[PDB]
Design a protein around this ligand. Structure first.
Ligand code: SF4
Ligand code: SF4
Ligand code: F3S
Ligand SMILES: [Mg+2]
Lengths: 534, 267
C-alpha cells in the first residue's frame, strides 16, 4: 500500500538556518526521524580570550530572526557575573524591547514561515470574495468587504498569470494536495492577511528600534543597564506606544482569529506531534536575580505531569555530544562546556548534527511557547489561563489537544496575545516610574578578575541561557545553550530522541514527494538552526 | 518560478544569522510586498519559499539555468576549512554551491558584512575558514557588489538593485567594492554629536550626566570615525540609529571589524 522508505527534507525551508530532516516511513507513517543541523560557525570558540563586554555584540549575531535575545542573554550573563543590579528603568526598557520582539517574531512565524504548510495560495484565486468577506467579518471585529478581498485576488491573479510564481514555485499545494483542506475563501482570507502582515511586521519591528536603535540587531544594552536616554522622553514613549497598539490590534483582530479558523479546519492535527517533557525559564523580571519574579515563571515538567511542576535547577543541564559532530561522548554542564568540532559526515560513528543535545536530569525537553504556556497555566497564571481556556472553548477541544502540533501552534498564538496585553502593563509601570522622578538607566560596575555568570532569557522559541567563566578579567569559557538546541538537537548518549525527533513518530505522509505533514510538525517548533548550533 | 517580465533573483544563505534576510523584510517605500510582486521575481529564498527539499532544489536549478538570466543576492560567509564541510545545503558544501551558481549570475550582490568580508564566523580564530564571497571565489572571476553592515541598511540593497536594473551596470564602487552612493562618508562626519567631538566633550561612562546630555561616545569606544556607512542619514526602521540610542558605533560595515574594532568600548 502506502509509502515505505526514507524521506529526506534538505533544505527544510521556512525556518531560520540549515536543517536536514530524515525520516523512515512504514506504511505511510513515520517510524523514525533524525534532526540534522548542517551549518556550524563556532561563536563559542571565537569568544575565548575576549573582553566580556564584547560578548553581547558577537552573540547577538547568533541569530537575526531572534535578534536582540542573545544580546539580552549575554548582558544578563555579564551583569550577573559582575554582580551589578541594573536600574529599574533598564529592566523596563529591556523588557519592553523583548515583548516587542515576541510580537514581531510570532506574527512573522505564523504567516510567513508556517502558513504555507496549510494555505493553498493559488486556490485563493477561485474564491468568492463576497463569501470570503462574510467569513472574515464573522471571525473578527474588524470588518472586511468583498472589494477589500477582491483587491488581493486581483493582485494575486496578475502575479500568477505571469508564470513567475517566485516564492510559490513548486509549492507542495500546487495542483492540489490531499493534506491541504482549506476552502478557497479561507485560503483567500489567509493570503490577504499574509500580505497584510508583510507590512504590519515593519511596524512591529520598528517598535524595537524606538528604544533599541535599530532592527535587526539592537544596540542599546550595556553591562549595568541601557544607553538610550532618549527612551525616557514622552515623544519616544508615545512612538513606541502607537506601534505597540497597532501591533496588538493585528494580533487580536487578524492573527488569532486566523489561527483559530485554520486550527478548526485541521483538527486532526491534535493527533500528531506530541512530546513528553517541558522546560521554561520565565521572562519579564521585576528582579534580575530572581527568576520567580518574572511575569512568566520558570518550571520543569516530566511526562506531562503538570500537577507536579518541578523547580528549575540550572545545575541539572548537561549538553551531550555522542550523536553530534564534536570530540568524544562526554556531556558537560555549560560552566564546564566544550566546543571541539569533529565532523564524521551523516551518521558517521552515529553522529548526524552540529547541534549538541541538551538534557535536563537526563531527559529531552521541549521548550518554547507550548512549554511557557502550559507551565504558566499550571502555575495559575490568570492571563494565560483566561486566553487558553477561551481558545480551547472556541475550538471545542479538551486540554489534551494541546499536546500536539496543533496545540503548539495554538500556544504560540496564546502567548502572543498574552504578551501583547502585558506590554501595555509594563509600559504603564515604566511611565509611572519616570513620573516618580527616576530617570536613571545605567548603574556603575567593576570587572572582577575571576567570576562565573549566567543569564536567562525565555525567548520566542524558549529557554535561552548564556554562561560565562571569567579568568584574568577575560572570557575563559562562554557557552550558549539555546532553545532550538533543546528542541531540535540530536539524540544524547542514552540514545533518547530529541523533542522534534520523537514528535515526528506517527506522522502520516500522504505523498512522499510533497511531505507537508513533516513540515507542519517541524515548523510548529519554529526551528532556528543558527540559534541551535552557533 | 520565472521567465517573462520581472527580473529573477536567487537569494542564497551561507554561514549567516538571517539578520540580513530580516533587514530586507524591513524595506520601506518600496515595501517587501511591492518588491516581490512588482519589482523583482524572488525565485529562491530558503527563509520564505513554499517548496522544501527536492522541490526547493528543483526551483533553484530552474532559476539558475533560466535563459532569462538571474541576479544573485548572497547572505553569509562561505566556510572553506576542511574542504567546505562546516556548511552544507542539500548535502552540498556552500563553497561548492556558490562556486557553481555565482559565475552564472548576470550580477552578484554580497549582502551583509559576512558575505562581503567574512563576518562574525571569520573572527579569530576562524575555526571554519569562513571567507567573504569575492575572497572565496576570486579564482572564478566572481566580483560581487559588496553591501556591508551587520546587517546593512536595506535602503542600500534596494538602491543598488534599482540602480542596476536601470543602468544595466554597477554604480560607482569604492576600494572595498561598496557603492560610493551609500558608503562614501564616515558615519562620524554625519553624526549629530560631532560638535561635542570637536569640543572635546566626551561622555566618560554610560551612567554619566554627559551621556544623558548627548555628549560624544568616542571615549566609550565609538568607531564612527573609522566606519563608512549612511546610518545617521537614512537611519534604521525610519526612526533611529546606534548613537542616537546612546551607544557607540561598533564599526559593523568594515572588513574584519570583529577583530579590528575590538574591544568595542575602547579607542
Ligand atoms: S552580516 Fe551580520 S546580520 Fe548579516 S548574516 Fe552576517 S552576522 Fe548576520
Ligand atoms: S558619537 Fe561617534 S560618530 Fe558621533 S561624533 Fe562621537 S565619535 Fe563621532
Ligand atoms: S555599528 Fe553598524 S549600523 Fe551603523 S552606526 Fe555603526 S555602522
Ligand atoms: Mg552551545
Amino acid at each position: 500500500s502506502s509509502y515505505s522508505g526514507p524521506i529526506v527534507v534538505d533544505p527544510v525551508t521556512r525556518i531560520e538556518g540549515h536543517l536536514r530532516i530524515e525520516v523512515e516511513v512504514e506504511n505511510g507513517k513515520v517510524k523514525n526521524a533524525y534532526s540534522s543541523s548542517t551549518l556550524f560557525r563556532g561563536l563559542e570558540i571565537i569568544l575565548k580570550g575576549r573582553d566580556p563586554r564584547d560578548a553581547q555584540h558577537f552573540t547577538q549575531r547568533t541569530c537575526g530572526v531572534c535578534t536582540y535575545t542573545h544580546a539580552l542573554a549575554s548582558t544578563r550573563c555579564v551583569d550577573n557575573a559582575v554582580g551589578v543590579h541594573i536600574p529599574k528603568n533598564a529592566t523596563y526598557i529591556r523588557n519592553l524591547v523583548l515583548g516587542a520582539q515576541y510580537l514581531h517574531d510570532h506574527i512573522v512565524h505564523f504567516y510567513h514561515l508556517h502558513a504555507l504548510d496549510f494555505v493553498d495560495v493559488t486556490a485563493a484565486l477561485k474564491a468568492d470574495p463576497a463569501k470570503a468577506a462574510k467569513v472574515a467579518s464573522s471571525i473578527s471585529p474588524r470588518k472586511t468587504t468583498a472589494a477589500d478581498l477582491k483587491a488581493v485576488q486581483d493582485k494575486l491573479k496578475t502575479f500568477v498569470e505571469t508564470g513567475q510564481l517566485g516564492p510559490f514555485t513548486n509549492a507542495y499545494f500546487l495542483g492540489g494536495h490531499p493534506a491541504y483542506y482549506l476552502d478557497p475563501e479561507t485560503n483567500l482570507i489567509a493570503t490577504a492577511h499574509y500580505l497584510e502582515a508583510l507590512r504590519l511586521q515593519v511596524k512591529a519591528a520598528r517598535a524595537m528600534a524606538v528604544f533599541g536603535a535599530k532592527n535587526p540587531h539592537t544596540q542599546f544594552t550595556v553591562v549595568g543597564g541601557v544607553t538610550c536616554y532618549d527612551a525616557l522622553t514622552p515623544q519616544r514613549i508615545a512612538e513606541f506606544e502607537a506601534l505597540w497598539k497597532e501591533t496588538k490590534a493585528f494580533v487580536d483582530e487578524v492573527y488569532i482569529p486566523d489561527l483559530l479558523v485554520v486550527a478548526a479546519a485541521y483538527k486532526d492535527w491534535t493527533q500528531y506531534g506530541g512530546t513528553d517533557n517541558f522546560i521554561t525559564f520565565g521572562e519579564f523580571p521585576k528582579d534580575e536575580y530572581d527568576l520567580n519574579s518574572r511575569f512568566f515563571k520558570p518550571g520543569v515538567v516530566f511526562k506531562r505531569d503538570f500537577k507536579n511542576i518541578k523547580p528549575f535547577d540550572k545545575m541539572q543541564i548537561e549538553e551531550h555530544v555522542r550523536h553530534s559532530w564534536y570530540e568524544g561522548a562526554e556531556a558537560r554542564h555549560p560552566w564546564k562546556g566544550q566546543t571541539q568540532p569533529k565532523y564524521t559526515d551523516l551518521h558517521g560513528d552515529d553522529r548526524y548534527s552540529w547541534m549538541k543535545a541538551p538534557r535536563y536530569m537526563g531527559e529531552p525537553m521541549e521548550t518554547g511557547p507550548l512549554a511557557q504556556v502550559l507551565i504558566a497555566y499550571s502555575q495559575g497564571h490568570p492571563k494565560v489561563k483566561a486566553v487558553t481556556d477561551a481558545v480551547l472553548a472556541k475550538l471545542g477541544v479538551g486540554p489534551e489537544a494541546l499536546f500536539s502540533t496543533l496545540g503548539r501552534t495554538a500556544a504560540r498564538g496564546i502567548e502572543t496575545a498574552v504578551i501583547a496585553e502585558y506590554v501595555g502593563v509594563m509600559l504603564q509601570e515604566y511611565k509611572d516610574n519616570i513620573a516618580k522622578g527616576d530617570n536613571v538607566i545605567c548603574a556603575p560596575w567593576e570587572m572582577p578578575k575571576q567570576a562565573e555568570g549566567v543569564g536567562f532569557v525565555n525567548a520566542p522559541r524558549g529557554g535561552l541561557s548564556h554562561w560565562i567563566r571569567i579568568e584574568d578579567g577575560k572570557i575563559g569559557n562562554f557557552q550558549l545553550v539555546v532553545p532550538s538546541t533543546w528542541t531540535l538537537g540530536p539524540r544524547c548518549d542514552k540514545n533518547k530522541l530529541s523533542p522534534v525527533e520523537a514528535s515526528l513518530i506517527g506522522t502520516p505522509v500522504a505523498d512522499a514527494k510533497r511531505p507537508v505533514e513533516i513540515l507542519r510538525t517541524v515548523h510548529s517548533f519554529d526551528p532556528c538552526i543558527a540559534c541551535g548550533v552557533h | 518560478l520565472m521567465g517573462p517580465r520581472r527580473p529573477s533573483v536567487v537569494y542564497l544563505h551561507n554561514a549567516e544569522c538571517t539578520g540580513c534576510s530580516e533587514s530586507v523584510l524591513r524595506a520601506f517605500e518600496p515595501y517587501i510586498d511591492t518588491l516581490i510582486l512588482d519589482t523583482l521575481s524572488l525565485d529562491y529564498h530558503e527563509t520564505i519559499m513554499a517548496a522544501a527539499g527536492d522541490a526547493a532544489e528543483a526551483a533553484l536549478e530552474q532559476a539558475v539555468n533560466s535563459p532569462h538570466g538571474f541576479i544573485a543576492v548572497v547572505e553569509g560567509g562561505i566556510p572553506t576549512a576542511a574542504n567546505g564541510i562546516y556548511g552544507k545545503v542539500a548535502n552540498h558544501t556552500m563553497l561548492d554551491i556558490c562556486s557553481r551558481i555565482l559565475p552564472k549570475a548576470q550580477a552578484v550582490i554580497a549582502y551583509g558584512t559576512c558575505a562581503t568580508f567574512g563576518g562574525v564566523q571569520a573572527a579569530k580564530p576562524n575555526p571554519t575558514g569562513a571567507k567573504g564571497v569575492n575572497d572565496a571565489l576570486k579564482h572564478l572571476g566572481v566580483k560581487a557588489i559588496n553591501i556591508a553592515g551587520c546587517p546593512p541598511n536595506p535602503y542600500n540593497l534596494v538602491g543598488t538593485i534599482v540602480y542596476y536594473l536601470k543602468n544595466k551596470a554597477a554604480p560607482e564602487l569604492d576600494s572595498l567594492n561598496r557603492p560610493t552612493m551609500f558608503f562614501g562618508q564616515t558615519v562620524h562626519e554625519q553624526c549629530p554629536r560631532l560638535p561635542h567631538f570637536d569640543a572635546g566633550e566626551f561622555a566618560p561612562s554610560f551612567e554619566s550626566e554627559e551621556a544623558r546630555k548627548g555628549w560624544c561616545l568616542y571615549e566609550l569606544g565609538c568607531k564612527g570615525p573609522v566606519t563608512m556607512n549612511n546610518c545617521p542619514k537614512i537611519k534604521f526602521n525610519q526612526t533611529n540609529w546606534p548613537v542616537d540610542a546612546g551607544h557607540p558605533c561598533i564599526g559593523c560595515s568594515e572588513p574584519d571589524f570583529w577583530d579590528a574594532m575590538t574591544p568595542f568600548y575602547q579607542n
